[PDB]
A paper describes a structure:
A Legionella effector LegA15, also known as AnkD, is one of 11 ankyrin repeat–containing effectors in L. pneumophila. The Dot/Icm effector LegA15, a 471–amino acid protein encoded by gene lpg2456 of L. pneumophila Philadelphia, harbors an ankyrin repeat (ANK) domain that is known to mediate protein-protein interactions in eukaryotic cells. LegA15 is a GTPase with a unique catalytic mechanism, unlike any eukaryotic small GTPases. Here, we show that an ankyrin repeat containing effector LegA15 localizes directly in host lipid droplets (LDs), leading to Golgi apparatus fragmentation of the host cells by hijacking the host vesicular transport factor p115.
Here, with crystal structures of LegA15 and its binary complex with a guanosine triphosphate (GTP) analog, we showed that LegA15 is, in fact, a GTPase. To further understand the molecular mechanism of LegA15, we solved its crystal structure at a resolution of 2.59 Å. LegA15 contains an N-terminal ANK and a C-terminal domain (CTD). The CTD consists of a β-strand lobe sandwiched by two α-helical clusters. Structural similarity search using this CTD in PDBeFold online suggested that several nucleotide binding proteins are structurally similar to LegA15, even though their sequence identities are less than 10%. Isothermal titration calorimetry (ITC) experiment further confirmed that LegA15 bound both GTP and guanosine diphosphate (GDP) but not NAD+. The disassociation constants (Kd) for binding by GTP and GDP are 1.38 and 20.5 μM, respectively. GDPNP is shown to bind a positive-charged pocket formed by Arg291, Arg408, and Lys367 without inducing a large conformational change of LegA15 because LegA15 in this complex is well aligned to its ligand-free form [root mean square deviation (RMSD) of 1.0 Å]. We overexpressed two LegA15 fragments (amino acids 1 to 192 and 95 to 471) containing its ANK domain and C-terminal unknown domain, respectively, in HEK293T cells, and found that the ANK domain but not the C terminus was colocalized with the LDs. Together, these data suggested that LegA15 is directly associated with the host LDs through its ankyrin repeats.
Numbering used by the authors: 19 to 424, 426 to 442, 444 to 451
Write the structure that this text describes.
């Protein structure tokens, strides 16, 4: 009980593996399952039975026995073989699901039964460690050197690279502080390059205002009740306002587009292209607000603290819908799904395309008045913002690959030239 925090930290470290070695482990054990030829594995049944066991809140010896039972029920020859191979429909391993749910007891039982911690599982752990549930479990605050965005996350979350560093850092999971800073700086930079774009000077005032009022450290907002009084106040005044929004282990997108200054009506733009959304729903949903005043300081505070306070995906969504008046959205911008990422850049960024669309509907006098010429205008504006990100990241990469010609080398070669044939690419001179 007093030894569990340190014990579990040690076990994550003992069970750490590199992605390829864990993939060999999975392959090895899938070959092993063909020798016994038993019931083929059924992952969806394993997780169904898994999520039911965890709610019983049983203790170790009990849990290991039921874990074995439901493993064998699901076509796995052992609990260890389930924990190593099973993934759910969102692509989570059981360890990674336990940690994302901030369920540290069940995560340690998984560790006691052979679950392995690959990079993903460790980068979900690290997001999970900055939360109240982690504090009540006995975990310390996170080391302060984990506060700079790793080069592998900086270039990978923007360009689309899905690699890993030599130190084991994934390119795919990020804290809300460094990634919100980077979305904010990347919008001010675009506004400053296009100073007649009246849309993006307002988008930049919203991002600058909310990055300053939220005051995120790692993934916890620091100025806790005030940030919501301050964001609600800017919405009641009729200004564009991004609301940082999250739940346990996952970042969404949320902003408010006013009809105009002093006006009390407008639009709520929600974005989720990852965990929590049913595929058909991937992208951005626009709700018409006729009484902004359901967007309360308490709603705003709950949004910004969802991950920290342990809020589930469904708890946050119920709130976003009641602040929109329990009405259905009036539009859905279908956007690409994103798995194995908390979507700290992806859901922020795609939300901007629904801002543009609200600023175009606003200036046209409503969504029912948009022409198809307006949609292509919106998509061109958006795609011009994104192409500005990609170019400035590539130019950042090439230049940096060269203030140091020895992870940066992988970052360029890997995915950007190996999963992106669609693109003026810059070389890697050898020294």
């Amino acid at each position: 009980k007093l030894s569990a925090p340190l014990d579990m930290l040690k076990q994550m470290n003992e069970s750490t593996m590199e992605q390829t070695k864990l993939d060999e482990l999975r392959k090895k054990m899938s070959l092993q399952a063909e020798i016994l030829n038993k019931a083929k594995a059924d992952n969806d049944m394993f997780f169904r039975l898994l999520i039911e066991l965890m709610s019983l809140k049983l203790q170790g010896e009990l849990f290991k026995e039921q874990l074995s039972k439901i493993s064998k029920e699901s076509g796995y020859d052992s609990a260890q073989s389930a924990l190593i191979q099973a993934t759910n429909s969102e692509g989570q391993s059981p360890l990674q699901y336990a940690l994302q749910k901030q369920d540290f007891s069940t995560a340690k039982y998984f560790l006691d039964n052979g679950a392995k911690a690959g990079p993903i599982e460790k980068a979900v752990f690290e997001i999970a460690l900055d939360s109240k549930a982690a504090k009540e479990f006995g975990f310390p605050p996170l080391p302060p050197e984990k506060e700079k965005l790793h080069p592998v996350k900086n270039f990978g979350l923007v360009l689309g690279i899905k690699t890993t560093s030599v130190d084991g850092t994934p390119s795919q999971f990020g804290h809300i502080a460094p990634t919100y800073q980077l979305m904010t700086d990347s919008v001010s930079h675009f506004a400053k390059s296009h100073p007649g774009n009246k849309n993006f000077q307002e988008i930049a005032n919203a991002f600058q205002f909310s990055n300053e009022a939220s005051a995120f450290k790692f993934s916890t907002p620091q100025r806790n009740p005030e940030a919501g009084n301050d964001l609600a106040r800017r919405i009641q005044g009729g200004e564009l306002t991004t609301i940082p929004v999250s739940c346990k282990g996952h970042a969404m997108g949320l902003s408010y587009v006013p009809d105009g200054p002093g006006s009390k009506s407008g639009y709520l733009v929600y974005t989720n292209r990852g965990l929590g959304a049913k595929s058909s729903e991937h992208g951005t949903h626009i709700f018409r607000i006729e009484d902004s005043s359901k967007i309360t300081p308490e709603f705003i505070n709950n949004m910004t603290s969802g991950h920290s306070n342990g809020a589930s995906h469904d708890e946050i969504m119920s709130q976003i819908k009641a602040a929109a008046g329990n009405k259905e959205p009036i539009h859905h911008i279908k956007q690409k799904g994103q798995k194995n990422d908390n979507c700290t850049i992806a859901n922020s960024k795609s939300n901007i395309e629904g801002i543009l669309l609200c600023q175009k509907a606003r200036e046209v006098g409503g969504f029912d008045k948009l022409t198809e010429s307006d949609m292509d205008s919106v998509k061109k504006e958006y795609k011009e913002f994104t192409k500005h990100m990609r170019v400035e990241k590539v130019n950042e990469l090439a230049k940096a690959l060269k203030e140091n010609p020895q992870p940066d080398l992988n970052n360029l070669t890997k995915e950007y030239l190996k999963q992106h044939p669609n693109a003026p690419k810059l070389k890697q001179t050898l020294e």
